[PDB]
Amino acid sequence: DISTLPRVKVDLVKPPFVHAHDQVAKTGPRVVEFTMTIEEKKLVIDREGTEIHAMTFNGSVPGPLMVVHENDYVELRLINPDTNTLLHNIDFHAATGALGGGALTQVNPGEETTLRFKATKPGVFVYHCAPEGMVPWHVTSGMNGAIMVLPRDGLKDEKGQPLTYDKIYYVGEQDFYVPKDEAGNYKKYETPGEAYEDAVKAMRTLTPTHIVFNGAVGALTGDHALTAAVGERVLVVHSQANRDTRPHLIGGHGDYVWATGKFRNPPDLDQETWLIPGGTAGAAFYTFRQPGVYAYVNHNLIEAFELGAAGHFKVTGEWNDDLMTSVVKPASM
Amino acid sequence: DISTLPRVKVDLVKPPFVHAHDQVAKTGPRVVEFTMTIEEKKLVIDREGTEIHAMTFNGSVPGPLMVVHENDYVELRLINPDTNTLLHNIDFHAATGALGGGALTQVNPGEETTLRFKATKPGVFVYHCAPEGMVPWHVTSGMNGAIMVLPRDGLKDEKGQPLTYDKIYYVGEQDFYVPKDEAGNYKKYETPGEAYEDAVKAMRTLTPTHIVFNGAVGALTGDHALTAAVGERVLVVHSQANRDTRPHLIGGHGDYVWATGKFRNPPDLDQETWLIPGGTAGAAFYTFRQPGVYAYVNHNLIEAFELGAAGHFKVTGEWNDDLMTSVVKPASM
């Protein structure tokens, strides 16, 4: 009887940050309540000022990361304010039935709905908008995110021993297909509906114009770099709702990787690079051993360094010469 | 001494259906006899009437699914009627030696051949035509299929306990590269040989014009939807002979997945989406828990909803509100 379960309301945080949670469950099963507001808005995605009409959950690309435990109930209030123009919905890959909730959550501007589903399978999962006839347009306009369903006893390594993380970040990777004129300049549109027919033609080429982390080229660089300390255990959740990706930590590894993001499976060890298939979320666990700047990339290096799928970590602490040292610094012969 | 083994002749069925078989082997090793007839034919692949010269095993795209058990012998009579124009052959990824049989099965129109091979490795495997100098043309014209080599004791879960399926379907996914004029309209050709030079140029772009299940856009929709009941255990075999795919059941999961299709390996659990590499067959096991319409897609959603890689399941039974319910149906705020 779900009426007699405790309820906890959770306020979401912008990526790459993640709302507060417990790894190991300190309560019985709960109804966990979330509210998300849909926002259609203009987004500048690159240093040249290219602008798209993004379709967002809660104002961000990606949508925020939701965290619950196995056999919790997720209750989502989805609001579509009347300032928007399009019909939207939400499809949870975590959920069972009705097209992941898509068939139950169709909201025109000025409408809201409340969905509940039971989080029966532990893992990280993609969620995304999927309106009939217009699925790829919404998704590739940024309307996707992820939910993490933790095991009630938290994460385990390949030997069934606890893995505890000190920090968690959510990297959502987004392929954009911005229409071009004959010469290759990006077009501008006053309203999403204006862009529709050009968007369809752009998508059909199967060639993204931009691939970005957290909604823009350079979004996770400089002062917006991810941070950690030597000796800190970091979990990086990575989702791609539409297109394959191959994450790599330049200077590091995936010590324990769930490339396809499902925790009943043992992790892969010592990964240099792993493939997250389009429409999947994955998770990688690393203990930092060296300080300095790391780049986190899609290791199609064209996609990373030309199209935008690259971020930085800034790591503090002591340099360890046992692991790596310059024996003879670069010098003329 | 193979002469003293029992023989069983099997009649193949069109995909997505699969010929009758036993999961757990009720006999000793056998010689299992199959006949396939090659058919070159015109195929309408989309709602606009685009026509290609398809090259088929037994008149279908994909070719039918063959089912045997480990250490059976497969004996294939391959017939190339004189109404065809091209040289064909067959390459079994299940088999060992002579380019999977390709070097032994080259048949001009008006010729036949009988190949035998021992099915030494359990799994689902791609088979395809592969004539020297013209391999990708035949394959991407639809000349490929799969064979399932079951373990003699059937399928097992990750703990070594039996998995029995109630229903099995075969989804063959096909990338087509239909040549275009300057404006982007599809060309027509009277004979396959006419299309050759344009096909090569079209293929080199690496950009399919169509990606379809069971040979046409919408082939697995409406009255041709796959069917199951709540509580039924369904195995979905999925092959892609040339290009990577990432299958997803909208509203469901892969409870147990062999993404690369080889049964001596434990399955992956609780998959939302899995990657089947080009040139591989995979298998996914799901128990339906909710009724209604499900979409089975390639979760590059452009490939699914724009290029054709989407099908439907129609599932009967009772709705379970514990798993999912509309708490507040869409309404004005």
Add this chain to the structure above:
Amino acid sequence: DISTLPRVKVDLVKPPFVHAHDQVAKTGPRVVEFTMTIEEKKLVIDREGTEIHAMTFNGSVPGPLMVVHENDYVELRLINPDTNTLLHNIDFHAATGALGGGALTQVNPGEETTLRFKATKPGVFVYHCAPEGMVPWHVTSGMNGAIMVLPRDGLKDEKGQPLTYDKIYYVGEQDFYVPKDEAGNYKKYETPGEAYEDAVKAMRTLTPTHIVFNGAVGALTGDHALTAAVGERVLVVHSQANRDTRPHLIGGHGDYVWATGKFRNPPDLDQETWLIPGGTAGAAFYTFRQPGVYAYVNHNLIEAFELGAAGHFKVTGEWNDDLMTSVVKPASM
């Protein structure tokens, strides 16, 4: 104290061959010393005479395969002769810190440097040049290779029993993006710097013009075919530093496969085809059972047979009719 460790200098060999090593370590941990010389040179990559300015480690595409054991130290002397024009460096995916050594190894023409790192994780790993601002250009001009870090007790199968190989080959797969004129003819350039701006535009299409093994179309064919004997155990290391690949042995299998190349993980069994993600090295173990010609391909068959990602094995010994036989050779009906 690394000063008191034994030192062994190793001379590298051209791919597809691999320098002499022990599988099971016969000594304690060592400092293993390697020297590589960077060479910018013109390369003919196809039968039509297309020429690129390749950027190489030790004069080859790919760079040579390095072999050490876990917890050895790798000491690399990297030389950039003054006949070169560009700044180069080296990034080891095997190493921890300083962008895999990239931040420590920036050498202008006329400079050298010596890097040391501890090989803490067993596996096959990509290494590549990665100069800030110009990473994909160097990598896709051929400046990448692999290092194998063997477990001290060698390789093990899924049951923890020894796997010993008789032969080892290194296949490096390279995507090239050669700029084209309007009509589709390849351009020539006198100097790498001349080609830069056209290279960037070519890369952005995400469509390779050539995908080759060992630096050229047909490089591993005919008299340069890989060789083995029936009953021989062969390890094939395969790397792709930038783009996904899906290797397949036509006529064979991967008996034991580390698709993502990391040996603390159990291998996948009985693979027909496996996905190596861009930026990864993998390894496949096969025991040859049948003689004759095998093709080793990327099983995107367009990439293999049109763009160049195909090689041959030539295998000697006795034909086994139990595994495969022609029952009725091709004949008129």
